[PDB]
Design a protein around this ligand. Structure first.
Ligand code: GTS
Ligand code: GTS
Ligand code: GTS
Lengths: 136, 140, 130
């Protein structure tokens, strides 16, 4: 009963890995050898890009599964895919120019804030169903 | 079903995370630090490093919360969960003001975490015996 | 039954905590007072080391549980242990010299990429039966 959620989660974790590869690729192109995190405009953008995806990734996974379990698996899955796409736009946009990230960032944050809300409703909804009412 | 309290704490915790991230985005405006910069003001560097610290501990906390939650007791884990959330509000806002004023916040969250870890470990160990050689001390 | 997955997960989270302690220890040895993240080669290596484990940790936990549930708990558990060990080699190798992180990194990344695939199979496998 969590098969779709699990599918989205492994994709999402591939996008994360693939983002991390791109950063390792930039350390070669722009000659930023560890433990450096600065030394090229081009590199600083690609680095901070994924860093942003890393710091939001746990938030997304929690909200995805909580909406997924407690409200509707299929809707959460779809919003999940939208988020994946939002972060593709974020990363590649940011990589080009800092200013070109916002479209990516706004839709990712949208979908997140939405999953949060659907999760919270679904949890509240089930909190009544372990007290009396199951709203239909 | 069995995890409604854990799920509640988790959504709240993930809001604190988002709310912290908003505050940093707000400081990039106040202290005029445009991406991809992470430095250029003492005030901004503290607010940035603050949540960065919460980001790097957040997965640790979620694992330990659910593992204590499932394998020991949902209700105790939930409450300790709330304590941690509060501890990190003290950490972030303390740090934001002065570096030195973060410690009370940090030592709390660390306390609660290290506790969740232990309750999780007992509960997992406890169930590992009761799937192989019985572990239940229920005498009185 | 997810008892073995839960066991690995708590250990992995202890390694994470322990790595974070080591960085806090380096802020004392190399006198890097917050909010600084630079000012010693020795400190920058120990800092970037854990940062790297933090940014992979959620990836690992998802892939661990997805391979664990959807394919086989016991195989995933073992690969789990391997990853833990791989990251001990990564962190401590990096801490000494940047160059001596690679064996740690290649194996951690190997096991991850493997768990990913075992997870993907196991999900696909169950998608055919529903
Ligand atoms: N996202 C990573 C880059 C991808 C990665 O994980 N890189 C590994 C392997 S490679 O970059 O050496 O190919 C690493 O050593 N991380 C560098 C570091 O973060 O210290 C980063 O923070 O630089
Ligand atoms: N947590 C972020 C700030 C919050 C955030 O995610 N902000 C987005 C959008 S904005 O606040 O810059 O419009 C970003 O791209 N942050 C910069 C970055 O992470 O490189 C940070 O570490 O700077
Ligand atoms: N992971 C931390 C080191 C361990 C830690 O959490 N340190 C805390 C408390 S202590 O190290 O000062 O006692 C901190 O304030 N780190 C915030 C920061 O990273 O800027 C780091 O990135 O430096």
């Amino acid at each position: 009963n969590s098969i779709l959620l699990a599918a989205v989660s492994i994709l999402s974790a591939c996008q994360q890995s693939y983002f991390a590869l791109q950063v390792g690729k930039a350390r070669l192109k722009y000659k930023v050898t560890p433990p450096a995190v600065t030394g090229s405009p081009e590199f600083e953008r690609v680095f901070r890009a994924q860093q942003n995806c890393v710091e939001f990734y746990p938030i997304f996974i929690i909200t995805l599964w909580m909406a997924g379990w407690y409200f509707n698996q299929v809707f959460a899955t779809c919003l999940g895919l939208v988020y994946i796409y939002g972060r593709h736009l974020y990363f590649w946009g940011y990589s080009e120019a800092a200013k070109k990230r916002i479209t990516g960032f706004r839709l990712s944050l949208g979908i997140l804030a939405l999953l949060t809300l659907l999760g919270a409703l679904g949890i509240a909804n089930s909190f009544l169903d372990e007290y009396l009412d199951l709203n239909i």
